[PDB]
């Protein structure tokens, strides 16, 4: 899609009370190991929600594909992306995180 | 009892890493003065025995 | 009950500061380190490299 | 200078970053290193959670 409706990501083991908080729009913000009640999410035009013990922090930097492959093994967890169907092009890493945290489940901001 | 009186003792400090079958007869303390593991004169640096 | 500390008190009771620092076992990735070494680089000889 | 109380302790926890340790133990400031197992040498050639 060329816009930026979808931004960020939620992932989860029992009842998305587990960790990775994520919002990706530019700057990547922290991997947060807090447990839920992230409440509003409609269209922030804000920022942030509620929290909790947090364990952990991260801040970084035709029509365009936006890709992304997400993983987790070894107590690692990994992330390859892409910005531009056939054809064919290789996915370079981006980050690994050590948190080492089982994920079941995972649902979408937009 | 009461026999065992500054008679029976043994080692417990560093550096000395015997290779097998020899006799430390020794009586080192680095009561002299150092800087990397404290030891000047009281301060990691005590009776091995 | 709060505790009385002046400065002509004795040694055993003057105010003393103590820090107890626990490190847990291995049993996830480790997060906890110090600085290994920074010794220089040569070339053109035989050398063991890490 | 500023601590809580003993029956009121502050706990922080402390990973994600590097250690040093040569500044506390090369500083005649503290006087008790009653350290169990670890030595100063060990704990600087290995890593924890
Ligand atoms: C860029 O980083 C700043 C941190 O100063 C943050 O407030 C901002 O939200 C980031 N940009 C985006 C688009 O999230
Ligand atoms: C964070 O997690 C620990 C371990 O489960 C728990 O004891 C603590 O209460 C939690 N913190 C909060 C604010 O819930
Ligand atoms: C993930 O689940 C396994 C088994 O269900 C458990 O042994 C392990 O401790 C869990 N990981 C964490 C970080 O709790």
């Known amino acids: 899609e060329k816009s930026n409706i979808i931004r960020g990501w939620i992932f989860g083991t029992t009842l998305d009370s587990k960790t990775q908080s994520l919002l990706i729009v530019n700057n990547a913000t922290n991997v947060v190991i807090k447990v839920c009640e992230f409440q509003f999410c409609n269209d922030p035009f804000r920022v942030y929600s509620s929290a909790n013990n947090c364990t952990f922090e991260y801040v970084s930097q035709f029509k365009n594909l936006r890709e992304f492959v997400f993983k987790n093994i070894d107590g690692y967890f990994k992330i390859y992306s892409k910005h531009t169907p056939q054809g064919f092009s290789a996915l370079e890493p981006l980050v690994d995180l050590p948190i080492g945290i089982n994920i079941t489940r995972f649902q979408t901001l937009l | ?49 | 009950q709060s505790y009385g500390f002046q400065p002509t008190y004795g040694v055993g009771y003057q105010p003393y500061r103590v820090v107890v620092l626990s490190f847990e076992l291995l049993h996830a990735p480790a997060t906890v380190c110090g600085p290994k070494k920074s010794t220089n680089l040569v070339k053109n000889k035989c050398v063991n490299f890490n | 200078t500023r601590f809580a109380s003993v029956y009121a302790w502050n706990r922080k926890r402390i990973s994600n970053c590097v250690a040093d340790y040569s500044v506390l133990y090369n500083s005649a400031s503290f006087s008790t290193f009653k350290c169990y197992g670890v030595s100063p040498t060990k704990l600087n050639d290995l890593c924890f959670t």
């Open chain 2, 1 to 49: 009892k009461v026999g065992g009186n500054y008679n029976y003792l043994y080692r417990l400090f560093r550096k000395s890493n015997l290779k097998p079958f020899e006799r430390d007869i020794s009586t080192e303390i680095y009561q002299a003065g150092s800087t990397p593991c404290n030891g000047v004169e009281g301060f990691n640096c005590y009776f091995p025995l």
